[PDB]
Amino acid sequence: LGSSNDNIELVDFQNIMFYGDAEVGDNQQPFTFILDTGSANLWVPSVKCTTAGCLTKHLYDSSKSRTYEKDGTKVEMNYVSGTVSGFFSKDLVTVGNLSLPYKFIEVIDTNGFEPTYTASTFDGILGLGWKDLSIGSVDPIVVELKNQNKIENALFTFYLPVHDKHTGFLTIGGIEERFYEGPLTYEKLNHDLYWQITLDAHVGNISLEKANCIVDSGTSAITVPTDFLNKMLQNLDVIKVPFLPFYVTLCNNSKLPTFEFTSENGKYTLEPEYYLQHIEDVGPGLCMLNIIGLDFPVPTFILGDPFMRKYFTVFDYDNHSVGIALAKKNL
Ligand SMILES: Cc1cccc(C)c1OCC(=O)N[C@@H](Cc1ccccc1)[C@@H](O)C[C@H](CC(C)C)NC(=O)c1cccc(N)c1
């Protein structure tokens, strides 16, 4: 296929978060979403949502769409970040220049997601993980488009925006060379759930062999197991503000190590310039480390936004793998 591909522009927010737009209904009602490789359902607040978080948002009115098909099955959507609840509905979903009938969650109660939702500019969340990661056993949007021949390949890629520099693009259907430099290395999904792969993690002299690494566009920090983080902070001139998950350091702290994740195919690193937020802050150069300690049953690193900002990433449902390449600095 001489190119093709459905490109959706990603809108940056202070190098912290980014968003993308999609539409629901044959009348293509507009909504801003967190495009999330770490969940597998699409949800939008309904016209029937009276909570406070819903007051500033674009709302879905299924009565204005001929393609709406009632479902009604009640759903409670529990993220680590909070809870939204509502019911299943079916209607047309438009992503970029493609449309398909689709089952999403019409949310009527966001109390379990406030004050977060109230202080959010996104309307909803659009999951991009595997079918089994979803509530309802909903086949991924991209898998669908492929089934219906609307796209070349059942894969999507993320070219994240870089603040002040350039825009991003979630590209569905194929891989565009305009976004990366050097080689594109594939790492096999270890499971068809999250986009999780096995990499040895190394920082300084601490090494965690065969760490489970979740590639999540929906996580704004790099997460690290706590015992690993504990060993690496020893003597680093990095201060933890107690109670709150924040780690601060002088932006010029020479001791700051580079994260190194490796497979027999490639070696991915994240230098201090990539995980340090602030830069020229409160006082001299106090910088915040965009890293937080988080423990899962098996040692896991969530390779969130800070990793994806440096690395162009490819998500291939056909080959059950994640491809990784150095993102091009500018378009
Ligand atoms: C924003 C942020 C900062 C730092 C660390 C994290 C983890 C983070 O992100 C917080 C967060 O909630 N992110 C999620 C998406 C999200 C982002 C913003 C607001 C709400 C949800 C997903 O990216 C990841 C999340 C956790 C996994 C990786 C353990 N998945 C589920 O909870 C989930 C998955 C499948 C099914 C269901 N029902 C739920």
**How far apart are the C-alpha atoms of 211 and 135, rounded to whole Å?**
26
Q: Phi, psi (5° rounding) for residue 200?
A: -80, 130
- Count Cβ atoms within 10 A of the Cβ of residue 204 and give its class: 0-12 exposed, 13-18 middle, 19 or more buried: middle
Q: Phi, psi (5° rounding) for residue 205?
A: -130, 5
Q: Domains in the chain, start-ordered, CATH in brackets?
A: 3-177 (2.40.70.10), 178-331 (2.40.70.10)
**How far apart are the C-alpha atoms of 205 and 130, rounded to whole Å?**
35
How would you write 203-240 as a 3-class SS string?
Answer: ECCEEEEEEEEEECCCCCCEEECHHHHHHHHCCCCCEE
Tokens of 313: 């990433």
Residues flanking ligand 1, CB < 6 Å = 34, 36, 38-39, 77-81, 125, 133, 135, 214, 216, 218-221, 223, 292, 302
Kindly give the pairing relationship between strand 206-215 and strand 300-303. parallel
Tokens of 105: 């969650």
CB 278 within 8 A of CB 251: yes
**How far apart are the C-alpha atoms of 265 and 184, rounded to whole Å?**
10
Task: Provide, for the chain, the percentages of residues in helix, strand and coil under a 3-state DSSP scheme, each rounded to the nearest 5.
Answer: 15, 45, 40
**How far apart are the C-alpha atoms of 25 and 67, rounded to whole Å?**
6
Annotated catalytic residues are 36, 216
CB 46 within 8 A of CB 106: yes
Cα 50–chain centre separation: 28
Tokens of 37: 């490789």
Concatenating the DSSP letter of every residue in 136-154 gives T-PPPHHHHHHHTTSSSSS
Q: Phi, psi (5° rounding) for residue 113?
A: -125, 10
Residues 6+ apart with CB under 8 A from 238: 247, 248, 249, 253, 256, 289
**How far apart are the C-alpha atoms of 197 and 216, rounded to whole Å?**
12
Nearest atom within ligand 1 for CA of residue 302:
28
Q: Which H or E run contains 309?
A: helix 305-310
Residues 6+ apart with CB under 8 A from 197: 187, 188, 189, 190, 213, 215, 263, 321, 322
The residue whose C-alpha atom lies closest to atom 15 belonging to ligand 1 is 218
Nearest CA to 54 out of 126, 127, 116 is that of 116
Nearest CA to 158 out of 140, 142, 138, 176 is that of 176
Q: Write down the experimental method used for this entry.
A: X-ray
Resolution to 1 decimal, in Å?
1.9
Find the 194 Cα to ligand 1 centroid distance in Å. Answer: 11
CB 247 within 8 A of CB 240: yes
Query: 60 vs 6, 19, 44, 48, CA distance in Å?
Result: 24, 18, 7, 8
Nearest CA to 213 out of 190, 186, 247 is that of 190
Measured over the CA atoms of residue 325, residue 263, residue 191 and residue 222, the dihedral's sign is negative
**Angle (nearest 5°) at CA 216 between 215 and 220:** 125
Cα torsion at 9, 268, 302, 144 (round to 10°)?
Answer: 50
